[PDB]
């Protein structure tokens, strides 16, 4: 089904091409920083939906399955994208190129310093591992396909995930990592997803506690309830 027939290079070139753009944002208060964030997230959601449709194998799924996967991992994807943008800005989170915030500017809103530090911690780890964009787009696609798969066909989804695994290994072998260095790096990357999952749950938790919010965001939020 197209995706499975692709080679690892044709997979990377497909994901790198389906990449969503970096959108822009409109002293802060509580409703101010949150208000800008929900506005930014809502606009990013539309690009994500079209990015998902261009992820190899995602269109082979039923419309119902597409909705489920997106409802489950939308915040994870926004988060790993945030972490990837903030990688070259240590101690800071680059929500938008015109919206760069750090730990002290962070708070205002209730908690959200804990999760802020988790994102920063998630931003330092990639930097330490020297995470490549080719690797990043692979991790993000995995999240899209993995996060909702055990919440449902036989699949297929596992077959595409396997291909993304083979693709990640190809990149590492293309970088001169020893056979042992490949397994280890693969493990280290996929363990970050456990933390991205955790951050998503704590952030979703805070979202259900409250900002007017859009109807689209409400539907993505009423899925975790």
């Amino acid at each position: 089904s197209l995706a499975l027939s692709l080679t690892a290079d044709q997979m990377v070139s497909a994901l790198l091409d389906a990449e969503p753009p970096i959108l822009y944002s409109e002293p802060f208060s509580e409703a101010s920083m949150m208000g800008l964030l929900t506005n930014l997230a809502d606009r990013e959601l539309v690009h994500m939906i079209n990015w998902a449709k261009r992820v190899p194998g995602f269109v082979d799924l039923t419309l119902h399955d597409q909705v489920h996967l997106l409802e489950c991992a939308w915040l994870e994807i926004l988060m790993i994208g945030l972490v990837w943008r903030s990688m070259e800005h240590p101690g800071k989170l680059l929500f938008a190129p015109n919206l760069l915030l750090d730990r002290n500017q962070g708070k205002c809103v209730e908690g959200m310093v804990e999760i802020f530090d988790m994102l920063l911690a998630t931003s330092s780890r990639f930097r330490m591992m020297n995470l490549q964009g080719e690797e990043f787009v692979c991790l993000k696609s995995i999240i899209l396909l993995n996060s909702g798969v055990y919440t449902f066909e036989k699949d297929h989804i596992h077959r595409v995930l396997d291909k993304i695994t083979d693709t990640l290994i190809h990149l590492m072998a293309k970088a001169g990592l020893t056979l042992q260095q490949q397994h280890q790096r693969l493990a280290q990357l996929l363990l970050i997803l456990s933390h991205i999952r955790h951050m998503s749950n704590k952030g979703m938790e805070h979202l259900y506690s409250m900002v007017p919010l859009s109807d689209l965001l409400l539907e993505m939020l009423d899925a975790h309830r």
Partner: peptide, 9 residues
């Protein structure tokens, strides 16, 4: 659901 609309447009 809006998500359906955006997944078909």
């Amino acid at each position: 659901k809006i998500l359906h609309r955006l997944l078909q447009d």
